[PDB]
Amino acid sequence: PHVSLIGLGNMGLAIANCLIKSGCKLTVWNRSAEKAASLVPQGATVAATPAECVASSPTIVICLLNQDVVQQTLDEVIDLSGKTIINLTNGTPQQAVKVATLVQQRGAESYIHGAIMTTPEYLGQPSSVTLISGPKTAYESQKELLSSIGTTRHVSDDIAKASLLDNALLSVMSGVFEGWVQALAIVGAAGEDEVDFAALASPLVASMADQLPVIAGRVREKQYVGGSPITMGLEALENISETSRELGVGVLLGSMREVMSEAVKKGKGGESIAGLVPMLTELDKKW
Amino acid sequence: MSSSNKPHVSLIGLGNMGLAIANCLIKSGCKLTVWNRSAEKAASLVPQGATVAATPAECVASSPTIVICLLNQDVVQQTLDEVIDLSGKTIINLTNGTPQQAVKVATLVQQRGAESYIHGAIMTTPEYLGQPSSVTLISGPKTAYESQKELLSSIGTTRHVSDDIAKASLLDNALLSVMSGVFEGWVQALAIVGAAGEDEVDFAALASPLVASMADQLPVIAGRVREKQYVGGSPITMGLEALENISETSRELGVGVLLGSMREVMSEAVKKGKGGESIAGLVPMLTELDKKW
Ligand SMILES: NC(=O)c1ccc[n+]([C@@H]2O[C@H](COP(=O)([O-])OP(=O)(O)OC[C@H]3O[C@@H](n4cnc5c(N)ncnc54)[C@H](OP(=O)(O)O)[C@@H]3O)[C@@H](O)[C@H]2O)c1
Ligand SMILES: NC(=O)c1ccc[n+]([C@@H]2O[C@H](COP(=O)([O-])OP(=O)(O)OC[C@H]3O[C@@H](n4cnc5c(N)ncnc54)[C@H](OP(=O)(O)O)[C@@H]3O)[C@@H](O)[C@H]2O)c1
């Protein structure tokens, strides 16, 4: 089986290693071609140009910095007739739309998008899940090949859905990390032990697994009443900022304060955090 | 309360949590004296055997043990203003506030001659108060904690975290930081999903695993922070680009964007040459500088 990979960054090299381990004949291209150095002894062929790399195989795996770079790399690649593109470059839903439209206008058989939900060092383990979006029949053709990078989950036939879902999941993760950095800064500056604190904290974050579905149900049915009030949540954030200032510690969660303050001004002070969702869906604003 | 001879307890504050505390103390058999600015919120406790005191001073005179649960530590100070004498009184403050607000209140009651001050951080909502699964952190003199343990079992399970009165507030604010970030992320995720036409409940099924995962990831990061091991983990540069992807996903959908303070501190990290470090490397950027991000 002939497979081409475009991009040999930390994730690209991890993908290259997984595909070699799968037993495929691998053709690779990278802007910095010397990053293929470790793949040549495994039997990988180095293509001079994107165009050449694409010519070598009917299945093209892409893992570059961003979808802007993907479009620039595909720029001169004019002939994709017969080619299946597997794009594992993270980006936005509409970025995936523009790339899928570009390759399909140039002949591509299909486009499927993958969001890898792990780091390079765990790629290829069954516990490592990649969300896949695009035509079912294209997923089914590529499922065996894709197993080389871990567990695939077909989320939708719409190519833009892996990026939509992965961006949603990264919001949650980003939120968790913002609160956690703030917590550890406070605990550290107070002379407390970060590991002991995690022993106390990590359990209560476990708990959220239970509460996040409840909040999600309330949001769908637009039931914004029921649960700790937004006024209470905003006071909490004011105690966090001042607990921090007392210790000379800086504070995150500014956007959360700003949106909750405006909610109170709009008279939603007595609603639960479910009532913050329409604050976002209704207005294009960076809080 | 195990004795047929029911002890006298005073309660200052009858908001949602104060009224939950009242019902816990009445249900445990206490002889309860209450005060509230809005006196009529006591009305539901009177047919249960609660006495309503005219003033905070009268309330404090009625019991050797005073439980306080008010809006904030400033209202606590305002309410103790005309209380002259706390001789032989134990003060149990369940009002949320900062570490130094607890210090400032602990000096108000000490100056009045209070026997002791302990602080409690209730880690649940009023409806779950009194279930043994409901945990309150207590900080203050371990001997005062020990004496008040049976009385405190009325509101559920207590955990003595420290002899320092400021610690319950320190730890609770640190815990509320984590929860605030979780909720900020969740509201952003739900807004993107909703605006795209996807099913919030279906998404919760997909995403509830990831938050459970953080049972493991968080103690890993804590360890890294304590050893100042900032290298190892997905780098801040990749974190920052995921935030730019999130901002632009939201913009495509006409949806607003939270996580600004995170975007700002991670950008500065990059400028300062810490782009290759994990999230652990952001902790020293907070501890080094009194700034709002
Ligand atoms: N933990 C992770 O790393 C992780 C996890 C999940 C998904 N991903 C995603 O996987 C993708 C790649 O990640 P990575 O960690 O491999 O990033 P990386 O190590 O920075 O690699 C960047 C890749 O993009 C190429 N590149 C950058 N600018 C270019 C340009 N102007 N023209 C041509 N090529 C260019 C690089 O080529 P050079 O080698 O010549 O610089 C390299 O192949 C990203 O979308 C990322 O979001 C990463
Ligand atoms: N989920 C929760 O509700 C929860 C969970 C854990 C901890 N807590 C903590 O418990 C405390 C009270 O919360 P809550 O839910 O009871 O709030 P609440 O329902 O708003 O109760 C506020 C209380 O403070 C009193 N108050 C406000 N301003 C005052 C003033 N200027 N002078 C005198 N009294 C004043 C109110 O008097 P009136 O009745 O006359 O208005 C009422 O007794 C807070 O520190 C909170 O963080 C709450």
Domains of chain B listed by start with CATH number: 8-167 (3.40.50.720), 199-287 (1.10.1040.10)
Resolution (angstroms) equals 2.1
The residues facing B250 across adjacent strands are none
Q: How many Cα atoms within 13 Å fall on the side-chain side of residue B210?
A: 26
Residue B110's Cβ-count burial label (10 Å; 0-12, 13-18, 19+) is middle
The response to whether residue A150 sits with its C-beta less than 6 Å from ligand 1 reads: no
CB-CB neighbours of A214 under 10 Å:
14
CB-based contact B245 A183, cutoff 8 Å: no
Does B1 show up as a binding residue in the annotation? no
B229 vs A251, B126, B278, B282, B286, CA distance in Å? Answer: 22, 41, 9, 11, 16
d(CA B91, CA B94) in angstroms, rounded, equals 10
The one-letter amino acid code at B261 reads S
| Backbone region of residue A82 per phi and psi (left: phi > 0; alpha: psi in -120 to 50; beta: other values) | left
Closest by CA position to B92, among listed B61, B119, B62, B121: B119
The residues facing B93 across adjacent strands are B68, B119
- Nearest CB among B255, B283, B285 relative to A281 is that of B255
The response to whether residue A35 sits with its C-beta less than 6 Å from ligand 1 reads: yes
- Is the CB of residue A171 less than 8 Å away from at least one CB of chain B? yes
Q: How many Cα atoms within 13 Å fall on the side-chain side of residue B37?
A: 9
The one-letter amino acid code at B81 reads D
List, in order, residues 6 or more apart from A49 with CB less than 8 Å away. A29, A76
- Nearest CB among B99, B180, B247 relative to A253 is that of B180
Measured distance between the N- and C-terminal CA atoms of chain B, rounded to whole angstroms: 49
Q: Which two tokens stand for residue B50?
A: 């609660």
Task: Say if residues B49 and B26 touch (Cβ distance below 8 Å).
Answer: yes
Task: Say if residues B182 and B215 touch (Cβ distance below 8 Å).
Answer: no
Q: Which two tokens stand for residue B274?
A: 């810490």
Residue A210's Cβ-count burial label (10 Å; 0-12, 13-18, 19+) is exposed
CA distance A55 to chain B (A): 31
B206 vs B161, B183, B239, CA distance in Å? Answer: 36, 17, 21
| A66 CA to centre of ligand 1 in angstroms | 7
Q: Which two tokens stand for residue B203?
A: 């998404």
Measured distance between the N- and C-terminal CA atoms of chain A, rounded to whole angstroms: 50
CB-CB neighbours of B228 under 10 Å:
10
Task: Say if residues B259 and A280 touch (Cβ distance below 8 Å).
Answer: no
Task: Say if residues A135 and A110 touch (Cβ distance below 8 Å).
Answer: yes
Q: What does the H/E/C string look like for chain A?
A: CEEEEECCCHHHHHHHHHHHHHCCEEEEECCCHHHHCCCHHHCCEECCCHHHHHHCCCEEEECCCCHHHHHHHCCCCCCCECCEEEECCCCCHHHHHHHHHHHHHCCECEEEEEEECCCHHHCCCCCCEEEEECCHHHHHHHHHHHHCCCEEEEEECCCCHHHHHHHHHHHHHHHHHHHHHHHHHHHHHCCCCHHHHHHHHHHHHHHHHHHHHHHHHHHHCCCCCCCCCHHHHHHHHHHHHHHHHHCCCCECCHHHHHHHHHHHHCCCCCCCHHHHHHHHHCCCCEC
CB-CB neighbours of B272 under 10 Å:
12
d(CA B84, CA B183) in angstroms, rounded, equals 43
Does B78 show up as a binding residue in the annotation? yes
Closest by CA position to A132, among listed A103, A96, A173: A96
Residue with tokens 């495929």: A24
The response to whether residue A59 sits with its C-beta less than 6 Å from ligand 1 reads: no
| B91 φ, ψ (degrees, to nearest 5) | -105, 120
Query: How was this entry determined?
Result: X-ray
